[PDB]
């Protein structure tokens, strides 16, 4: 893992020592090459998971996320190349440094072996993301959005710290292999239930549960494009990954401590998907779509069947890529019309015919088009939940209908219809934007070709 | 579509509109042309039977009765002209009515393919540039002193001047591009 | 009813300009200045067929259970090619 971490660190010296002219090109290129290097973690020809040292490890669950993180950084730089067009060189380099630091910390987090590695490297992500939202955001309420994002997560996390310390005192260690191979059954004492909650709540907040999902619609419509991309591609999955790694010890309490959160997920999914129908902000609509998908992920993880885990992982990756693409597209139209309303710009298929194609493909990934890995994930989660209780199909079906509905609503409202001819400023699509969308789609298509890579530990 | 609606309508306009609508619905009911003529003549007879009524209160009551009868007898599925609002192919060609401001973004190599058309377009842009100042002043000076305004715009009064606010009226895409 | 004098004049002026623009839209004779048999059968029904039959025969079939087929119908008085068995006849009916 240290053949992937160190190049990432060295990106920073490159960013700061490069000449002002070539800095963007150099960092983008070397970040792509770091992404290439990260593929070495897919040479798992045996069931023995990789453990590169006492500190860093990898698994079938961590390799896809690490590779996704590596892949995102070049795309984040391309997406940020524009709105930073007229800032001073040091400020541009600061932005690039923030993104590089975010990648470093996230890779280390996903590759951490001890949960008190994880608890530090997980919260260290707050600083770069908070800076990205607050400093380079546009509208005034970005400060409030930053405050929400910081403190929701910190309130969630502190109880996680307490629980982890108790765990270490009780067990003697926090290496996840050791916890897995020496776990023991919890008893249904009230203190154990309180623990279960303390361990699970920070991750559930980062996987915004229906009742604690108010920090996404704000953080996203106040954050720049790169912030939104990294956030709702990787940060949101920190919660799922933590939950998956930590639930091993917290058994058998889950059987009855999951009813509340399963119910909240399976209801908030419908509520948020419906909210997407009548929202006048494209960024917000995408954010609430993300909330619904993470609701599904949470339900599956909290039922813990092999299908649940594998489908949850698949959908984690699929949502990463798809939501990222959607946000880049919306930012594309925003960079021109300088507004976030969906109603304002319409019929843009009459002037951006190809970007309309990318819009269509993204909407299909969102609505879950077979055989796309997005569908595969949702289908397998549905099978798991139906096994868990055969009545969940009602909620699942209502959500499927509404998902298709807002997914096509975006397209019809924006791409189709009479062109708002008064928009003189609409300019031909930049090769940068088109290449960004292509780099988002092509990995999705290749993984749909080869799903075996993105299955979880179970399958 | 080429004239702004009035603040209201008079008895004359309302009754004429009712006459047209009722005649078209009568036609929609009577498919055959001969039958349509037979009944449309009776319809004109009815309409003119009360043509000269100088008690406008009774006139309005008669018109209200006619309108209610119309709503009772309207064809559920009337006849709609293909391009008419609510008819098949109402907006069928709005996909290809791409505006003219897009040409400004054409690559010079694309403009090379059409040399003359763009020269003429450059002349047109020059003309518009020249005429904007005069036409804005014209509207400002022709604004009514009182606070009563109508959508209808003024014509060109001076000589060698384009009519006020003409760029959008002219240059609109061809119906069938 | 009827146009006002101002409306008539405005419509006439816009008419003139509209028709001038429409005539402007005409393309000149040089305007599109462009800058400087079984062939289908062989190259779309036979070339693909070689590749596809290669795949089928030398991969699909060579794998197990890839190409499975329902039993061919066997009737009385029917001779099996391989064993040589002759399936017996049918009892006569009145």
């Amino acid at each position: 893992m240290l053949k992937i971490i160190l190049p990432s660190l060295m990106l920073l010296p490159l960013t700061w020592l490069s000449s002002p002219k070539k800095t963007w090109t150099n960092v983008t290129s070397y970040s792509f090459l770091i992404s290439l290097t990260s593929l070495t973690l897919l040479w798992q020809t045996d069931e023995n998971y990789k453990n590169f040292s006492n500190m860093f490890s990898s698994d079938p669950l961590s390799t896809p996320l690490i590779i996704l993180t590596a892949w995102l950084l070049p795309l984040m730089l391309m997406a940020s190349q524009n709105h930073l067009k007229k800032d001073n060189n040091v400020l541009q380099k600061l932005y690039i440094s923030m993104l590089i630091s975010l990648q470093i910390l996230l890779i280390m987090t996903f590759s951490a072996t001890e949960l008190i590695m994880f608890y530090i490297l997980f919260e260290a992500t707050l600083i770069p993301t908070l800076i990205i939202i607050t400093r380079w955001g546009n509208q005034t309420e970005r400060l409030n959005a930053g405050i929400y994002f910081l403190f929701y997560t910190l309130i969630g996390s502190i109880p996680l710290l307490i629980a982890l310390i108790l765990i270490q005192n009780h067990v003697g260690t926090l290496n996840l292999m050791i916890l897995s191979f020496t776990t023991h059954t919890l008893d249904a004492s009230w203190s154990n239930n309180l623990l279960w909650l303390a361990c699970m709540m920070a991750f559930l907040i980062k996987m915004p549960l229906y009742g604690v999902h108010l920090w996404l619609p704000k953080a996203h419509v106040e954050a720049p494009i790169a912030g939104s991309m990294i956030l709702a591609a990787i940060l949101l999955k920190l919660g799922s990954y933590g939950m998956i790694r930590i639930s091993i010890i917290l058994d058998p309490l889950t059987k009855y401590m999951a009813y509340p959160f399963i119910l909240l997920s399976l209801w908030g999914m419908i509520m948020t998907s419906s909210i997407c129908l009548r929202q006048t902000d494209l960024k917000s609509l995408i954010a609430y779509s993300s909330v619904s998908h993470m609701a599904l992920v949470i339900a599956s993880i909290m039922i813990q069947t092999p299908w649940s885990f594998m489908g949850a992982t698949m959908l984690m990756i699929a949502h990463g890529l798809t939501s990222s693409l959607l946000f880049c597209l919306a930012n594309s139209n925003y960079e021109r019309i300088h507004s976030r309303t969906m109603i304002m710009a319409r019929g843009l298929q009459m002037v951006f015919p190809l970007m309309a194609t990318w819009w269509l493909m993204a909407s299909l990934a969102n609505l879950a088009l077979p055989p796309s890995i997005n569908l595969m994930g949702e289908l397998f989660i549905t099978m798991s939940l139906f096994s868990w209780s055969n009545f969940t199909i009602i909620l699942m079906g209502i959500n499927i209908i509404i998902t298709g509905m807002y997914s096509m609503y975006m397209i019809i409202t924006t791409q189709r219809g009479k062109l708002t001819n008064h928009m003189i400023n609409l300019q031909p699509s930049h090769t940068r934007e088109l290449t960004l969308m292509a780099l988002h789609m092509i990995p999705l298509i290749l993984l749909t070709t080869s799903p075996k890579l993105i299955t979880g530990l179970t399958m | 579509a080429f004239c702004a609606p009035p603040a209201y309508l008079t008895h004359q306009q309302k009754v004429l509109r009712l006459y047209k609508r009722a005649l078209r619905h009568l036609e929609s009911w009577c498919i055959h042309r001969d039958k349509y003529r037979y009944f449309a003549c009776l319809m004109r007879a009815r309409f003119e039977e009360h043509k000269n009524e100088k008690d406008m209160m009774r006139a309005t009551q008669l018109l209200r009765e006619a309108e209610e009868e119309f709503w009772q007898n309207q064809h559920p599925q009337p006849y709609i002209f293909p391009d008419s609002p609510g008819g098949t192919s109402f907006e069928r060609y709005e996909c290809y009515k791409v505006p003219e401001w897009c040409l400004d973004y054409w690559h010079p190599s694309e403009k090379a393919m059409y040399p003359d058309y763009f020269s003429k377009r450059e002349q047109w842009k020059k003309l518009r540039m020249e005429s904007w100042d005069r036409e804005v002043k014209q509207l400002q000076e022709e604004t009514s002193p009182d606070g009563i305004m109508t959508e209808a715009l003024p014509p060109a009064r001076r000589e060698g001047d384009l009519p006020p606010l003409w760029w959008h009226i002219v240059t609109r895409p061809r119906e069938r591009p | 009813s009827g146009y006002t004098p101002d409306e008539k004049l405005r419509l006439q002026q816009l008419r003139e300009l509209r028709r001038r623009w429409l005539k402007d839209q005409e393309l000149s004779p040089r305007e599109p200045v462009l800058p400087p048999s079984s062939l289908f059968a062989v190259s779309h029904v036979l070339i693909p067929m070689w590749f596809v039959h290669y795949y089928v025969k030398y991969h699909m079939a060579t794998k197990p259970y890839t190409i499975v087929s329902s039993k061919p119908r066997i009737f009385p008085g029917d001779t099996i090619l391989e064993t040589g068995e002759v399936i017996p006849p049918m009892r006569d009916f009145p």
Partner: peptide
């Protein structure tokens, strides 16, 4: 006879 049909820029 043949009239120019305006189109959005496709070169890009």
């Amino acid at each position: 006879k043949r009239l120019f049909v305006v189109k959005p820029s496709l070169y890009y």
